[PDB]
Amino acid sequence: SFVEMVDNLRGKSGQGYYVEMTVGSPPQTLNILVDTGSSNFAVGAAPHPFLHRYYQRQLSSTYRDLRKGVYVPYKWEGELGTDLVSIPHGPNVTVRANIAAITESDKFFINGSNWEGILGLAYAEIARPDDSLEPFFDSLVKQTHVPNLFSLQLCGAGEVLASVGGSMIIGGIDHSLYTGSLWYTPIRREWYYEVIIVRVEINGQDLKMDCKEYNYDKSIVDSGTTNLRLPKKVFEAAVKSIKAASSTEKFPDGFWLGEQLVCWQAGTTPWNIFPVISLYLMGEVTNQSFRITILPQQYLRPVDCYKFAISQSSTGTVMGAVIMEGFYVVFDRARKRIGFAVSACHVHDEFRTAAVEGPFVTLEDCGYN
Numbered sequence: 001s002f003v004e005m006v007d008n009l010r011g012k013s014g015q016g017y018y019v020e021m022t023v024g025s026p027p028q029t030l031n032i033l034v035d036t037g038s039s040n041f042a043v044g045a046a047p048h049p050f051l052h053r054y055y056q057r058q059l060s061s062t063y064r065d066l067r068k069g070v071y072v073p074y075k076w077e078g079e080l081g082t083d084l085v086s087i088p089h090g091p092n093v094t095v096r097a098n099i100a101a102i103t104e105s106d107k108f109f110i111n112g113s114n115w116e117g118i119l120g121l122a123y124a125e126i127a128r129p130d131d132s133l134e135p136f137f138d139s140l141v142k143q144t145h146v147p148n149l150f151s152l153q154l155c156g157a158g159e160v161l162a163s164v165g166g167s168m169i170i171g172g173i174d175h176s177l178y179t180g181s182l183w184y185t186p187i188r189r190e191w192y193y194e195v196i197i198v199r200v201e202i203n204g205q206d207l208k209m210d211c212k213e214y215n216y217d218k219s220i221v222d223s224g225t226t227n228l229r230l231p232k233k234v235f236e237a238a239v240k241s242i243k244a245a246s247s248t249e250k251f252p253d254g255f256w257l258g259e260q261l262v263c264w265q266a267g268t269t270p271w272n273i274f275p276v277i278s279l280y281l282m283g284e285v286t287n288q289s290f291r292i293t294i295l296p297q298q299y300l301r302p303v304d305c306y307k308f309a310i311s312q313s314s315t316g317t318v319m320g321a322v323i324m325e326g327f328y329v330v331f332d333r334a335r336k337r338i339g340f341a342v343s344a345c346h347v348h349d350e351f352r353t354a355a356v357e358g359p360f361v362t363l364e365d366c367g368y369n
């Protein structure tokens, strides 16, 4: 029953969402980042200044060495093996999964984030060292009767970094988690969770760009990324429009670059001054699309004071947490699609709300690749 998976996610704002997992026998408890933007189950397996716990292979009677290392610059490196893996607040099963035991790493773990490893939920194509190393979710599906699907409701927050909650529903869709209709955009290719954006508007205003720019060189849905990340040309056009809409109030360019924080005090934030942002995603039907509309409450993340959670990308559009936090997101791997619905937990004022709305007719040459 999915009820037992509700609120199975925790995290610190900006530091990602983690689910509790156990590895080995006896079960070693670890907090593990839910990451739809990578494909390795990788866990701290040696002391680290940011690690208070780590996977200890020698303590596990069920550990099996694959005698094969992994070096992953991008860094973390480790030793491959398999072990029994469970998710206490997830499906009631245990799986023998590939585990990359991280023995050394640079700027990989985050200080104070409270997770000790990463659960790469994307596809084998991008797994390290190569695509032969079966990803956790593939193993889970193959070894159990768990349906080939999962969904994420990331809720966010709403002196110490704010705590965020959410739910990872594995093997299905929990209707209590969203309102209205689920709209689906095709997964263009099975590596990252790649999608196509066909239009974007700021406060109703079309950016009027060739839609190839929205997906240059790709667009992906990535829970392991905090920000909405946009290709250069789109970022600039987006910031311009956002600057204009919130003109009545000047902010340092350091804020727009997402380096500096801006502050008011105790519910004086002029949300209404900032525009909503609509991303139109390719629909399941050729020239049919749908939009997800996010509020400033999503793209200004709390740090009184917030940081601009829209930033520039050189590797394509990244729809990260702040985009997902508005919605219930369905990673329908079995049907190669990703659904979006308004989340039961999304943050909104008494004038606007995050929305998922369709259809809108558009007219398929938007992918780059």
Ligand SMILES: NC1=NC(c2ccccc2)(c2ccccc2)C2=NCCCN12
Binding pocket: 016, 033, 035, 036, 037, 038, 072, 074, 108, 109, 118, 222, 223, 224, 225
């Ligand atoms: N999706 C995602 N996951 C990681 C990551 C997230 C958090 C901590 C450490 C690494 C990641 C994880 C494994 C391998 C490479 C990057 C990442 N790095 C920047 C782009 C977004 N991205």
